[PDB]
Amino acid sequence: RIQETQAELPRGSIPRSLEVILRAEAVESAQAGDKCDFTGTLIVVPDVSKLSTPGARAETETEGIRGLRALGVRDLSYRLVFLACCVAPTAESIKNQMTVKEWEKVFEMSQDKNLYHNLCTSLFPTIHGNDEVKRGVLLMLFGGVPKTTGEGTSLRGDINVCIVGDPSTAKSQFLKHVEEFSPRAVYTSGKASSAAGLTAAVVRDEESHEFVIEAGALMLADNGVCCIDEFDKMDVRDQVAIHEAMEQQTISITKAGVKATLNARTSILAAANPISGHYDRSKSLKQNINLSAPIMSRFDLFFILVDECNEVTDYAIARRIVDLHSRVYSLDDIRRYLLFARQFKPKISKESEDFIVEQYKHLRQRDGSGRI
Amino acid sequence: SDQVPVGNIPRSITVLVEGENTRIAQPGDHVSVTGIFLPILRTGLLSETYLEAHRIVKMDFYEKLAASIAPEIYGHEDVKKALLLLLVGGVDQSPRGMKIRGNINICLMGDPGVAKSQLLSYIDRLAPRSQYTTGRGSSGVGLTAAVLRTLEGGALVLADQGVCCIDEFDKMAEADRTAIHEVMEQQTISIAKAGILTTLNARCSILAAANPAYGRYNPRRSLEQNIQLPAALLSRFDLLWLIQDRPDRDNDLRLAQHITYVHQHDMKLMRRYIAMCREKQPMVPESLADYITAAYVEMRREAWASTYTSARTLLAILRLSTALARLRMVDVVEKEDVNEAIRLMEMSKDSLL
Amino acid sequence: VIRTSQLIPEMQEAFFQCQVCAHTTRVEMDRGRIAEPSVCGRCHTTHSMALIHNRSLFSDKQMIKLQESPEDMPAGQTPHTVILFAHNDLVDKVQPGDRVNVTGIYRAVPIRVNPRVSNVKSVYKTHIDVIHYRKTSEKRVELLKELSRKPDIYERLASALAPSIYEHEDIKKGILLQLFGGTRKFRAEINILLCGDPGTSKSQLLQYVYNLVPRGQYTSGKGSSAVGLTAYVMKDPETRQLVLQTGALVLSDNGICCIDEFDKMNESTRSVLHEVMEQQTLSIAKAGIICQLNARTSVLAAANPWNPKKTTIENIQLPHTLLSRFDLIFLLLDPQDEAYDRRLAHHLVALYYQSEEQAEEELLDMAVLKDYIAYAHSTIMPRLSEEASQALIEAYVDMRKIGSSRGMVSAYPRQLESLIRLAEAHAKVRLSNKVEAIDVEEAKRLHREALKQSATDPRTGIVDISILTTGMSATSRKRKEELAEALKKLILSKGKTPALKYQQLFEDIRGQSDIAITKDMFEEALRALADDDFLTVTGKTVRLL
DNA sequence: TTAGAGAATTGGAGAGTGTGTTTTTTTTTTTT
DNA sequence: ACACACTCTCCAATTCTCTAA
Ligand SMILES: [Zn+2]
Numbered sequence A: 001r002i003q004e005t006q007a008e009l010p011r012g013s014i015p016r017s018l019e020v021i022l023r024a025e026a027v028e029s030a031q032a033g034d035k036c037d038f039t040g041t042l043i044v045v046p047d048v049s050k051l052s053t054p055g056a057r058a059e060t061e062t063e064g065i066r067g068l069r070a071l072g073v074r075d076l077s078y079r080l081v082f083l084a085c086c087v088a089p090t091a092e093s094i095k096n097q098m099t100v101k102e103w104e105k106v107f108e109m110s111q112d113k114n115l116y117h118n119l120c121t122s123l124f125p126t127i128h129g130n131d132e133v134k135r136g137v138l139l140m141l142f143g144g145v146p147k148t149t150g151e152g153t154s155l156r157g158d159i160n161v162c163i164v165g166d167p168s169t170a171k172s173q174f175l176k177h178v179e180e181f182s183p184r185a186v187y188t189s190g191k192a193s194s195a196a197g198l199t200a201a202v203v204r205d206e207e208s209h210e211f212v213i214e215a216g217a218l219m220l221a222d223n224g225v226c227c228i229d230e231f232d233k234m235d236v237r238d239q240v241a242i243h244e245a246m247e248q249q250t251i252s253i254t255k256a257g258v259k260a261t262l263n264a265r266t267s268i269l270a271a272a273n274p275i276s277g278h279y280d281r282s283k284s285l286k287q288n289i290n291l292s293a294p295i296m297s298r299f300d301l302f303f304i305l306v307d308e309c310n311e312v313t314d315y316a317i318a319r320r321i322v323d324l325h326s327r328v329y330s331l332d333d334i335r336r337y338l339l340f341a342r343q344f345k346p347k348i349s350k351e352s353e354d355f356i357v358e359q360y361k362h363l364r365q366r367d368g369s370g371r372i
Numbered sequence B: 001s002d003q004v005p006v007g008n009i010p011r012s013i014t015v016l017v018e019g020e021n022t023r024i025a026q027p028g029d030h031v032s033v034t035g036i037f038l039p040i041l042r043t044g045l046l047s048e049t050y051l052e053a054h055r056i057v058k059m060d061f062y063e064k065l066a067a068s069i070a071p072e073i074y075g076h077e078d079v080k081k082a083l084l085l086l087l088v089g090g091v092d093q094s095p096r097g098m099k100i101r102g103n104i105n106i107c108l109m110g111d112p113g114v115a116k117s118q119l120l121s122y123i124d125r126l127a128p129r130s131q132y133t134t135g136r137g138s139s140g141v142g143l144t145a146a147v148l149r150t151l152e153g154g155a156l157v158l159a160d161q162g163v164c165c166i167d168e169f170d171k172m173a174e175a176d177r178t179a180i181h182e183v184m185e186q187q188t189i190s191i192a193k194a195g196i197l198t199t200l201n202a203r204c205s206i207l208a209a210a211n212p213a214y215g216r217y218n219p220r221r222s223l224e225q226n227i228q229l230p231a232a233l234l235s236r237f238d239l240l241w242l243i244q245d246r247p248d249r250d251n252d253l254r255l256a257q258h259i260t261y262v263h264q265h266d267m268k269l270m271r272r273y274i275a276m277c278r279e280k281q282p283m284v285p286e287s288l289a290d291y292i293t294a295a296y297v298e299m300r301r302e303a304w305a306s307t308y309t310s311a312r313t314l315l316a317i318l319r320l321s322t323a324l325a326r327l328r329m330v331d332v333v334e335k336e337d338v339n340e341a342i343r344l345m346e347m348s349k350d351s352l353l
Numbered sequence C: 001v002i003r004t005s006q007l008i009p010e011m012q013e014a015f016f017q018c019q020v021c022a023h024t025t026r027v028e029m030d031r032g033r034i035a036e037p038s039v040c041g042r043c044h045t046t047h048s049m050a051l052i053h054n055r056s057l058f059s060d061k062q063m064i065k066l067q068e069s070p071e072d073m074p075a076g077q078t079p080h081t082v083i084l085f086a087h088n089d090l091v092d093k094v095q096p097g098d099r100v101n102v103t104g105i106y107r108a109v110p111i112r113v114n115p116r117v118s119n120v121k122s123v124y125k126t127h128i129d130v131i132h133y134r135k136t137s138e139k140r141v142e143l144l145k146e147l148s149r150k151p152d153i154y155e156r157l158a159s160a161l162a163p164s165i166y167e168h169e170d171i172k173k174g175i176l177l178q179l180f181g182g183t184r185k186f187r188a189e190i191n192i193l194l195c196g197d198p199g200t201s202k203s204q205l206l207q208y209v210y211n212l213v214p215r216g217q218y219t220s221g222k223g224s225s226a227v228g229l230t231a232y233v234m235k236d237p238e239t240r241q242l243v244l245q246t247g248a249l250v251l252s253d254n255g256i257c258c259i260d261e262f263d264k265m266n267e268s269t270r271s272v273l274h275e276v277m278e279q280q281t282l283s284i285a286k287a288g289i290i291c292q293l294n295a296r297t298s299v300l301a302a303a304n305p306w307n308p309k310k311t312t313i314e315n316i317q318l319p320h321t322l323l324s325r326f327d328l329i330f331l332l333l334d335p336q337d338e339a340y341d342r343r344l345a346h347h348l349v350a351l352y353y354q355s356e357e358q359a360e361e362e363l364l365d366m367a368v369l370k371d372y373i374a375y376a377h378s379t380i381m382p383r384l385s386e387e388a389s390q391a392l393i394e395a396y397v398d399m400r401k402i403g404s405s406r407g408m409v410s411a412y413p414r415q416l417e418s419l420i421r422l423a424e425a426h427a428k429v430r431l432s433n434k435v436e437a438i439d440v441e442e443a444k445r446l447h448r449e450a451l452k453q454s455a456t457d458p459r460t461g462i463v464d465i466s467i468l469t470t471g472m473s474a475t476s477r478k479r480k481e482e483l484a485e486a487l488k489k490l491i492l493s494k495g496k497t498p499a500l501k502y503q504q505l506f507e508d509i510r511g512q513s514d515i516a517i518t519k520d521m522f523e524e525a526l527r528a529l530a531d532d533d534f535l536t537v538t539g540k541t542v543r544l545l
Numbered sequence D: 001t002t003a004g005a006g007a008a009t010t011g012g013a014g015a016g017t018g019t020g021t022t023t024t025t026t027t028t029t030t031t032t
Numbered sequence E: 001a002c003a004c005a006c007t008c009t010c011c012a013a014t015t016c017t018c019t020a021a
Helices: A094-095 A099-112 A115-123 A129-140 A171-183 A236-248 A311-326 A331-341 A350-369 B063-068 B077-088 B118-126 B174-186 B223-227 B249-264 B267-277 B286-305 B313-328 B333-350 C138-149 C154-160 C169-180 C200-211 C265-281 C338-352 C355-381 C386-404 C413-429 C435-455 C465-472 C474-493 C502-512 C519-531
Strands: A036-046 A076-090 A162-167 A185-189 A201-205 A210-214 A225-231 A250-255 A258-263 A268-274 A301-305 B029-038 B048-059 B104-112 B130-134 B163-168 B188-190 B200-203 B206-212 B239-243 C006-020 C025-028 C050-051 C058-069 C082-086 C100-109 C123-136 C192-197 C219-220 C232-235 C242-245 C256-260 C281-286 C289-294 C298-302 C327-333 C499-501 C535-537 C541-544
Touching: A076 C006, A076 C025, A094 B104, A094 B333, A099 A331, A115 A129, A115 A331, A129 A162, A129 A171, A129 A268, A129 A301, A162 A171, A171 A185, A171 A225, A171 A268, A171 C519, A185 C265, A210 A258, A236 A250, A258 B048, A311 C058, A311 C413, B063 B077, B063 B118, B063 B267, B063 B313, B077 B104, B077 B118, B077 B239, B077 B313, B104 B118, B104 B223, B118 B130, B118 B163, B118 B206, B174 B188, B174 B206, B200 B267, B239 B333, B286 B313, B286 B333, B286 C338, C138 C355, C154 C338, C154 C355, C169 C192, C169 C200, C169 C298, C169 C327, C169 C355, C169 C413, C192 C200, C192 C242, C200 C219, C200 C256, C200 C298, C265 C281, C327 C435, C355 C413, C386 C413, C386 C435, C413 C435, C435 C465, C465 C474, C474 C519, C499 C502, C502 C519, C519 C535
Parallel strands: A162 A268, A162 A301, A185 A225, A225 A268, B104 B206, B104 B239, B130 B163, B163 B206, C082 C123, C192 C298, C192 C327, C219 C256, C256 C298
Antiparallel strands: A036 A076, A201 A210, A250 A258, B029 B048, B188 B200, C006 C025, C006 C050, C006 C058, C058 C082, C100 C123, C232 C242, C281 C289, C499 C541, C535 C541
């Protein structure tokens, strides 16, 4: 069943709808919510319930036609249907899509010097300062290899990143910018716009007064990136559910009529406000923010953003803004290169183990001397 | 209903009207029918019946008229005049769509058990076209129309070219408040038969009766704190009156003597007077407009110095003065009409204290 | 009109083909009866001819339902209805709710007792067979060019709005600038908020401007409203199939949406409104439907609590997350001025004698203003100048400097966007393809006036930006902090005890304070000290950490 | 050569038979 | 009580054959 698209509906009118019929190789190529162009013919279909045949009988403010032998003393009526012969939207895949130009570009990128900074500049050209944040958020896109232990338990792949800052400054820009760049990503907030919110919920379906699930933001963001704004202010119901979703990458439900396990495999980038709006530069992050220790311990990286009214900096920011309004690598190069890079699965070397265990031991004894 | 034997449900009969007998009967009307009683043709031995109809048969002046309203009730002299002008009405000005409506609307705030029920029922009985309802949302049909298995009913609908009275207004729900709000603005309503957006006339004036949230009215608190309807719709009424009363030996003895006497042992002229006098639509000259301007700005100066005054106040003054001009057999408003309206709206505050 | 059916196809000429030998024949048909062949004339085999549905010839029909209009009814009765059939050319010319005059043939038909049986009832059904129905430029460009070249055109166009309102000129200018808007990354359109007492003329003003723009919409934040702000899915009353109902915000895309009783909308409505105003799109995921919709709409809202001791956001219900999105905010209340009342009453008296001698002139100016706006919107794109760039940078620097005396922030990029949008709109009002210092100085004037009225702390007479970014004066913040420190000192002075009674602490504080501290203030201080890991509140007992 | 009467085969006009056919109480989740 | 599907019968139309006009 299809409906008039938002562009066609004449003002004040109710939408019209039509029944479309698909056959053979075209079947199950369109899902509810999709917008597509169909090619075919308009046809007329009779009321089959009032015809009679040697094989099967008839079943039984307008009138139909009369006077056919097969119709007896009943009357026959028609309706309109559209028979569509075609429908279209309105590892090997990389080898198929990349021409020699794309291969040369990813090779040049692989051989590039200070590629890290070049990609930071290319992906975040509008941003000023704050290189550490740019390096951190850039690494999140490359993820980490997931592993399954022999007894069947599994080890987490995605990293999670958190940014805290004053409402006047940069933290919102990163979220909306990476969301505009990235494929298959979701933007939302702790003050969510639906009954489901950040994780699945149960609703009663009035077609049977039967209980069914409804997806939250972290279910839809499966196999993608999730951006959450104003994370310091969030519902308790979701906050408990997030404990499992952050590490186990799954959601579990057990209520009347519904019992299920749902996937939530996602990289989260969270943005939050400190208490009293401006960050107290004299105090730790843990004193400044609203989050509890169990949630806070989940993230792999943390960053702080806070303003001060330096005249030259303000003047430079203003000139940048007005100049932008007055007007190395493209985003598609970054996309193609990122999809190329994510096929590698590097191992750790034997010698790297000694450095890793040493650094962790150094960190642990430092913590013990003045938790990790 | 009075013919039904004790503890029973009333019955009904189908009547078929044909030929020159059509269009006589109406819904809700008393009738006497002559006919033949017959069984219905099939297309068991038990069969339905109906009545085949052969004939259907249906079953000065200002002070005098003011004193004629509710003479059973002592005092309340100017309240009776306010109700008189509620029945007479003002004028719909209709200047090219910049509408000012003529219907008066008022509300009475009563202490527990006070005499307002007698006055209310007197106006209900007196008025040539009117209806009554109560805000508790009883098991019957509501303020608006309803559906059964065609559309029917509704107190707001059944009073149309007349006045409708609401009792215990303070117990209304949000549905009731929104319905009253819509009637006050558009004087029409909507009820969905089967999802279709049907709409229906409700042209009548409204009279409201309300009681404080707890006990007697408290003069140390505002009327909004006492009665607790929202101020937006509560301030629509042209006049507000607090009906407060308390014991006294002689007045209680007089009342008791009257009640025990009653237990132991011309409306046609009034209707004709309001019929002939309401033909008038008196205008105002520019001199009266200037006079009203001066009076209104002085009144608002005192109002803020002593606020409640707004454009609604000016339109109320216009309505009551034009209504009095209609009560006279005169083609225009005059100074005395404005002065009468001014003292009536002014003195109404005294009832709250 | 009440309801209109889907389009119905109707037979005209049947096409018959022989199964045995493929011979074909056509049958012109007789008042609904088809003369089916008994035998194929070519091959002489009986009962071998078949009707080919999609080779037959068809026509269009539609069924329309109509009701008597409310004016001509008997008092207190419900209305009557009739059914109309319209063929060929006329088959789609009316929609529900509007009103028509119709001419037709009054037909009558018998009806069958059941679909199988051939008996008919003795009382017929009637309908109307429709025949006709009726519903009840270089010169303009040159006039617009001359009018735009006239001086004080900005004031004149603003003055043309809402003639019933005699004094609120700068508010009219703001509304005019919203109607003109910026031009196309960043949100180019403008959002405005009106605040103050109920019963003021703001709702009339919304209804006035709603009637000026083609893509306009109007609704209320109350649940009783006629159309919702939220999109949803429901069953069609006719077919009982699902239909997707988009909300007013989506329908008003590239248009103006007027919202009334904005202050008392619920939290879910606030959330979806926040999403729409930030992202300019709306997201849906229900009943198998998953999609994203364009919802780039201009919001104009009217809100309510007056109390001069507190700023607007301190009086009304809504959060700073939403209030900080409007480009300008205005407050409407009575001035307690004798001359203002005299002029208002005089204007009202003039309106009482309102007459065609000036109503026609106002109507003509309204039509010309619609043409002016449509022309300007159709072609004009203001672009930056060096003078405007310097003035805008200086305005941002002024706002940063205003905070420097207090050692604090008092400007951020969103304020500069509001100035740019207002300057572009003012440039477009002048029909200028350049935004220039003329626009920026007026934008600064409007922004400064709006800041003065919206963001002044009445406790000091000074604009406090933290009101607009946190919901309270800095006075409240200082008082809360001082209360928390006093509470901490009181607990420490009794620190030999591990648990202190809630009521005793309230009485101690209230016995030592000059302010009459409330239960909410005391509990907010306790919550602050709990977030600081100094104490835990266990019911009626406060315990130390 | 053209046409009518007596005998044989076959189509279908017609009859008979069998069968079908809004309005109330209680639970569960999440909104308040 | 009022419609399909099926089965079955008897009456007389169409052609063969022999004969007269
Ligand atoms: Zn054939």
